[PDB]
């Protein structure tokens, strides 16, 4: 019920702003949590604007209408994490979807996409999986989309979460499962990967 952007990326020393919106938020107290990879969340903001003891003075939050904003002045490398707003009412806590904050440490790099059609073996098993492998992108946030001719497909898709490679760039994979009759009833299938607002696409045909 709370909307936050999927990601934000900022240079070191710049100010990062992460919004959280919902129409009920005028009537609710919002809280912000930081979660670094592998670790549990830490509360960085209590009751819309109050900073807990222990939290750096560069974190602050303000309210405007149906939107509360977490501001991190002079962002440092150590602030890179996922940030979650949370609010609720008398019966429940609700969370936004989370925002990946990347503090840019190298230049942006577009993804490399390789798409594999189902093998003959698999189709012989009355089965079909297309595999889309995505590598070498930075920041590590992408939107993956599949299309059968020009129609977006949402059913049958499994996409892994981006993870760093040695090179500090990221890699991810996505799978589309289909029946053999679905594979044969289309002229082409595409894996579309969008990163920093530009799309890379690969297509296979039956």
């Amino acid at each position: 019920e709370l909307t936050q952007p999927p990601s934000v990326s900022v240079s070191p020393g710049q100010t990062a702003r992460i919004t959280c919106s919902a129409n009920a938020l005028p009537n609710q107290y919002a809280y912000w949590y930081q979660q670094k990879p592998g670790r549990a969340p830490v509360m960085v903001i209590y009751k819309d604007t109050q900073r807990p003891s222990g939290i750096p003075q560069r974190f602050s939050s303000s309210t405007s209408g149906t939107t509360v904003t977490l501001t991190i002045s002079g962002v440092q490398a150590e602030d890179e994490a996922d940030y979650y707003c949370q609010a609720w009412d008398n019966s429940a806590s609700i969370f936004g979807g989370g925002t990946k904050l990347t503090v840019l440490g190298q230049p942006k790099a577009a993804p490399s996409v390789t798409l594999f059609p189902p093998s003959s073996e698999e189709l012989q098993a009355n089965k079909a999986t297309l595999v889309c492998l995505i590598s070498d992108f930075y920041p590590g946030a992408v939107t993956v989309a599949w299309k059968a001719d020009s129609s977006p497909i949402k059913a049958g898709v499994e996409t892994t979460t981006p993870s760093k490679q040695s090179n500090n760039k990221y890699a991810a994979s996505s799978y589309l499962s289909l029946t053999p009759e679905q594979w044969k009833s289309h002229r082409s299938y595409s894996c579309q990967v969008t990163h920093e607002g530009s799309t890379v696409e690969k297509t296979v045909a039956p």
Partner: peptide
């Protein structure tokens, strides 16, 4: 009860 979370375990 604020319905917020100040300390979290490891999971």
């Amino acid at each position: 009860t604020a319905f917020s979370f100040d300390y979290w375990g490891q999971g």
